[PDB]
Amino acid sequence: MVLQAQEIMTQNVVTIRGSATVADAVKLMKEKKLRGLIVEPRHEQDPYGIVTETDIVYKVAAFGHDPKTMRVYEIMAKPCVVVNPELGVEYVARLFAQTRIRRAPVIQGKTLLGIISVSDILFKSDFVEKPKRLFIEDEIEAAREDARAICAAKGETSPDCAAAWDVVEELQAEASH
Amino acid sequence: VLQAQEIMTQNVVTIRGSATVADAVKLMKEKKLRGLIVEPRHEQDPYGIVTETDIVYKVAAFGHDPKTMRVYEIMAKPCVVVNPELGVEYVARLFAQTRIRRAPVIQGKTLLGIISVSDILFKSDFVEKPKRLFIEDEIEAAREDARAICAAKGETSCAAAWDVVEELQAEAS
Amino acid sequence: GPMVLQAQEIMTQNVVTIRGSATVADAVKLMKEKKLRGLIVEPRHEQDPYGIVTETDIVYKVAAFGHDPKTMRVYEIMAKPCVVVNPELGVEYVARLFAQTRIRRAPVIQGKTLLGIISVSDILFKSDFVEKPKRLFIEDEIEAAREDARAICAAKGETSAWDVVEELQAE
Amino acid sequence: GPMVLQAQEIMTQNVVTIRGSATVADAVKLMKEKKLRGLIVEPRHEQDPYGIVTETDIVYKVAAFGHDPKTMRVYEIMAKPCVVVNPELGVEYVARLFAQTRIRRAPVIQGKTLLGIISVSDILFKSDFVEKPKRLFIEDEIEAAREDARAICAAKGETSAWDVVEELQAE
Amino acid sequence: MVLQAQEIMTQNVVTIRGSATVADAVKLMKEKKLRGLIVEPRHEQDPYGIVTETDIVYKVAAFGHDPKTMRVYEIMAKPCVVVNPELGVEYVARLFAQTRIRRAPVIQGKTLLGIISVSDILFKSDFVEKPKRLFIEDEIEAAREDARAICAAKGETSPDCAAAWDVVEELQAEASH
Amino acid sequence: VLQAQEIMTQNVVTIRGSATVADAVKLMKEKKLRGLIVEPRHEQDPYGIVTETDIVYKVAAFGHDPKTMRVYEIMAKPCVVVNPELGVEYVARLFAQTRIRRAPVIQGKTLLGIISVSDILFKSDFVEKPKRLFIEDEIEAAREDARAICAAKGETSCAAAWDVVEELQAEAS
Ligand SMILES: [Cl-]
Ligand SMILES: [Cl-]
Ligand SMILES: [Cl-]
Ligand SMILES: [Cl-]
Ligand SMILES: [Cl-]
Ligand SMILES: [Cl-]
Ligand SMILES: [Cl-]
Ligand SMILES: [Cl-]
Asked: What's the superkingdom here (chains A, E) (predicted)?
């Protein structure tokens, strides 16, 4: 059974309103050692948002702006990239790499469950013991079509036929390992 | 509030990640589709997407052979997905912020459609109903600003603050 | 056909322009009317560059922030000068230009003359890359080898690699 | 002079090409010899695009990884097709093209004819932007206002904003 | 006295060799809850390097590579951006924003002192209480030249002269606040 | 090993962040400099840099007035600095990784010069001495690989591993 986002997420998740001051966000973040706060939907159809340590440092501290007057809505990401609780941990890694984020709320429908970060992955994913070759089932399926085509064209007992099924075999050994 | 589902393209073609890029292009030519949704292999598997830009930039721009390359080599999986109920203004903004042009519209595990920058341009109400993003947050923050002025100055001056509020609420309406 | 397919053979041939001074609203109006995802911005005079405004400019810079299209002008979101395409540019090179400049569409300009607009959509729907794939710079790979093959059959005898220039040639 | 300074007036006029099939080593050799930071890659024929290889291509893709320039070919690190510059393009528009495409140099091409190479260095050392600054798209700002000024003196009487089209004009 | 990088850095800094496996790096990182490891110079002239949580998640986990065979040198940044111990915390924020990193060794000459991150800034910088308007001394100096030029051109008792010194005054009030 | 200081441009002009962009351009024209170093205002203040690309992209490309814009508005401060002793191969690599083209060469608090991609192209020994980056790490990792093979297989087979090592050391030499 593939390890899931919900299994490694930080379960204690804290929200803040978009209208709050960056100072409020900072105080909350220091008090609980949080590197991301989820921004509270204002109603059922309103997306989730997120404000991160990197937003705060890059957009506020780096320009010497005053966090006591700046608001969260001015720095947050809303809507933000979200993670399904069932999403396998190799996919959460890939999402984060592709969208260039380090952190996302874990959301089931409209319901906030947690927050998942690069740190959650580093510290709690099974990627060292169980590295999952991405899309390996698509590779197997493609390689089986190649083998069938080659075998039907060149003969079911030809060396190229055998070599093409050996590509399938190797990919299949890896997946069930 | 205009929703993603009210402007999405409803007819949505799926393809497997194992299919050749040539198979993708053939289906896209046939129906004039600029994205195909990649279908989950099982219940925990995310949605994926393969677009015209993926094909042009990753295949055609190197002169690779589409008959031998596969969809899984150029798709985005997991992809950014859109909730059917998300305001179109927020769709525009998600797309800007993640630098994508199109996404499947998903409810639970179910594909409902695909939505693009083209759908927003052609069908959104952004010209006649410009939506100031986060204007409701500005309104709560101006209220909080007023209460700090009334407890510090006193219950008139405090009145100067409370007007700012009305000018924003007027603008929301 | 056996010749390299050119940009002018797959471009969208219909091209209305708009002025840089027009409102974004006018641009959207025109785009909706004729189903356009890019509009070419008209040079003010013979020496003024071509420009372009796209669906992405409008959606990312206007809609995404809630700006009023009726007050914004095209000049505020357009790209001018824009990347242009020569009519005779091989469709594979258009693909490559687009990936390296991170654009999706451009006008096809012949000297000072606007001829059409070519997009990633044109390439996807009308390119021959599926039946005639051809690795970019294969011709240069050859030149380089047919020259290494000069120096290898110069030093290590004319009797002993050359089929590389032969195989690459059929490809 | 009072006219907009053109790219051809500040370009570096001397232009040696190199073939895409040449080794990186040959390219560096030529670049060192004549103090060049960009080399134009020669079209293989009338329909083949211009290309360019730069000091940054060489330093980032070759030196930074320790690759052997004597074995790598220009085609492996060049940009082809490259962004090109029309000889008559206003020097401010060249600046802008460069920022929007994130390049620092390009060939100046007249039709199919190579005329020179223009760089951020040419702009910095030879542009008139210090004595003659001119906000990009000011001319469009005017057009837009001289038209708002039509509709404001159409609705709210010809007796009552227009000096905007006047002040902007001297600027 | 301006708060410095060395005052807010994580002092306990851990190094690893470039030749170590990504698995070794991961184990070290989990054991001490580290989000960056500094890569050990091989000799006195050899630059420092860094490998981060984000390198590991983006380059290893996201592609299902095997950390037990991959080496740190394949994913690290070497040389890396480094932070002088005396660098004011508003500048460390700005460096990180401009180079798009979240984490850097603190280095004095060739000597490693610590590691400083976006989290160190969020949790321990004085940016909420003392926001520092970047380059405010350059603005003051520029505004004083403007005032002098204007006053000499238009008269030392003209309204535009007074308005230009008022720009200086406002900037000066802020800096000593 | 060729060092940054052996290929840097030695003559280095500084400018204050308060200077106009026009003042920057005038000095750059006069000496043909594609960067100026911005000098620390005091002992804890970092080095900064302003380059030809900053000027062209941030000033000329908008048609802003260089006589009114100031250096502080377009400079990089703090900037990426280079140690005089850093191998040129590593300079190339720092520049690739941070996407810069030039940097001051600093020792302690002292400006020694400026080094660019041009200095590397013109004066580096990268053609005749290509430097495989991290080859010394590859060598330690292949040694560690050998010892794991000798304790698991036994002291010959283990011999297959130890050759890989020599082929890399040969290549370092
Ligand atoms: Cl973050
Ligand atoms: Cl975290
Ligand atoms: Cl797309
Ligand atoms: Cl577009
Ligand atoms: Cl360059
Ligand atoms: Cl990181
Ligand atoms: Cl940290
Ligand atoms: Cl530069």
From this structure: Bacteria
